């Protein structure tokens, strides 16, 4: 549920030592009154909202991949070329040298350039009334009327938590030399 | 009342957001002493030459014409190694392109004498890609942004070739600190 | 009537309290002959240079970049004269100082405050009163750091020690 005035909206501040700015409208999902540096006063809110959502989804996929590749789950035949170890950095370097990550880079960049760049440009220019992070992708049909929130808010919160989790896991792998779990 | 690019300076006069790329950035007051049409024509010309020049500095390393004289990967060697009569022909052809393309109005006193002459509008549209009205302002903004980026990039590549004696891409692959 | 700081000196006539931090201290009468906008721009530029210099003297001995050799900051000036980094820093300071010249010319016309460079990307001053307070804090820290940088460099010149090792013994 949208819980405007409890979880989002005007008047909600989760870290009350930094007062809620007047710049935040409360329309954006995840607006919980945290802008100490006042960035919302001068940036375009739609662009940074879509950037936060895309960074969050990338960090979710990164967390899922890091945990399944550091625990030991692998595809059939995937261990041989990419090394029978569990260290994510060496997995990156081996899969680059194999050519897998160039192929991933090519297709992710093709997806980014072909529809992502026009979606961001038309969304910012005001030609489609497209919302940030809305790429119209609902294959399984799980949000129809619950899209207002209990889908958006939980996604952005898990995105931010995934960002913090992936950063923590990477810097632990740097300092310790051993992957998580 | 203040410039948007430089917020501690007042907005330069005759700059009102009409031209493409106008963010009010003129701290030295060049537009307060010289006319904006000549400045825009000069900016577009420097930028377009630097677009072609940056593309050349990147392409000549990967692709060469056949022959010994065109086999220098570093562009400052290709300036000297190329046949001299060809480069003098290039100079003369650039002079002719300047002469006819500006329609014999070449100076600071006769270019823009015709009121229909627009800064950077030489009439050049060989494939007529500008036949669309709402694209136009975005197109000029993209052109001037590509030109400015190309000017800064080509300056950096030429002086880095001077420092390193290396062609740009293999200088990025075979980097040696100063 | 009299100056607020020095009770036996008269208040300087051009020190009317329009600039934050004014306590009527100008016994030589520098504000009686010279433009106070120029003097305040010079004061703030010298003070900001001194604040950055004192912070550099603390941090640059606490930490040193791996891609540089280790030495004292006074010897670092002479070293970076010859390596070339000091020339780069002087060049970029001069490049910013050209627009500082333009900003000073805007100040002399009264269209710009003698300390306003409109640089607040973190939005730290929301309303007026906090900005007035931060001006008083900046001016006081500027004067303090102007004294403190001369202290740091002259104490290195006499003891041949950096600040933090002089703190540990004598």
């Amino acid at each position: 549920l949208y819980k405007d005035g409890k979880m989002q909206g005007k008047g909600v501040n989760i870290i009350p030592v930094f007062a809620r700015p007047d710049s935040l409208d409360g329309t954006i999902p995840g607006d919980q009154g945290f802008d100490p540096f006042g960035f919302s006063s001068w940036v375009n809110m739609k662009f940074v909202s879509e950037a936060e959502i895309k960074h969050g989804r990338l960090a979710m996929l990164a967390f899922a991949g890091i945990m399944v590749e550091s625990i030991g789950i692998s595809f059939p035949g995937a261990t041989s070329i990419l090394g029978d170890s569990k260290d994510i950095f060496e997995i990156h370097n081996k899969a680059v040298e194999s050519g897998a990550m160039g192929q991933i880079l090519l297709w992710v960049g093709f997806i980014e350039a072909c529809v992502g760049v026009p979606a961001m440009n038309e969304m910012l220019s005001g030609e489609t009334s497209r919302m940030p992070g809305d790429f119209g992708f609902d294959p399984l049909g799980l949000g129809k009327g619950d899209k207002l929130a209990r889908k958006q808010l939980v996604e952005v919160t898990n995105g931010r938590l995934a960002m913090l989790a992936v950063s923590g896991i990477v810097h632990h792998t740097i300092i310790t030399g051993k992957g998580p779990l | 009342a203040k410039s948007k690019a430089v917020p501690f300076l007042s907005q330069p006069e005759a700059l009102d957001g009409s031209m493409a790329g106008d963010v009010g950035f003129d701290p030295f007051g060049f537009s307060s002493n010289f006319d904006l049409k000549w400045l825009r024509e000069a900016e577009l010309k420097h930028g377009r030459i630097c677009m072609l020049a940056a593309t050349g500095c990147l392409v000549q390393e990967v692709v060469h014409l056949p022959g010994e004289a065109f086999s220098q990967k570093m562009a400052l060697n290709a300036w000297a190694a190329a046949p001299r009569g060809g480069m003098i022909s290039i100079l003369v052809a650039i002079g002719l392109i300047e002469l006819i393309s500006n329609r014999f109005a070449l100076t600071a006193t006769d270019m823009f004498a015709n009121p229909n002459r627009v800064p950077g509008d030489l009439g050049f549209d060989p494939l007529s890609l500008g036949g669309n009205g709402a694209n136009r302002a975005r197109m000029e903004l993209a052109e001037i942004t590509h030109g400015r980026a190309a000017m800064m990039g080509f300056s950096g590549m030429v002086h880095q070739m001077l420092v390193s004696k290396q062609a740009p891409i293999e200088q990025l692959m075979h980097f040696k600190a100063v | 009537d009299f100056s607020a700081a020095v009770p036996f000196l008269k208040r300087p006539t051009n020190l009317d309290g329009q600039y934050i931090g004014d306590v009527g201290f100008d016994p030589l009468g520098f504000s009686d002959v010279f433009d106070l906008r120029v003097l305040r721009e010079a004061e703030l530029k010298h003070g900001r240079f001194a604040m950055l210099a004192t912070l550099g003297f603390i941090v640059q001995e606490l930490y040193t970049f791996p891609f540089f050799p280790k030495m004292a900051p006074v010897d670092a000036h002479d070293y970076f004269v010859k390596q070339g980094g000091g020339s780069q820093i002087i060049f970029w300071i001069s490049f910013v100082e050209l627009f500082g010249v333009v900003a000073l010319f805007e100040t002399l016309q009264g269209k710009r405050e003698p300390g306003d460079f409109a640089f607040d990307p973190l939005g730290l001053a929301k309303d007026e009163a906090t900005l007035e307070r931060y001006r008083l804090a900046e001016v006081k820290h500027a004067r303090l750091a102007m004294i403190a940088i001369g202290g740091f460099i002259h104490q290195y010149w006499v003891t041949k020690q950096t600040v933090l090792e002089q703190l540990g013994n004598f």
Binding site: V96, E97 | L172, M173, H174, F175 | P66, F67
Partner: peptide, 25 residues
């Protein structure tokens, strides 16, 4: 020259390798 962007051991010292060695010293 048949080498990579980063982590090269041989006759290939890229700008990224120079950055990495500058941090790792």
């Amino acid at each position: 020259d048949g080498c990579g962007a980063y982590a090269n051991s041989g006759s290939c010292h890229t700008f990224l390798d120079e950055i990495g060695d500058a941090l790792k010293a």
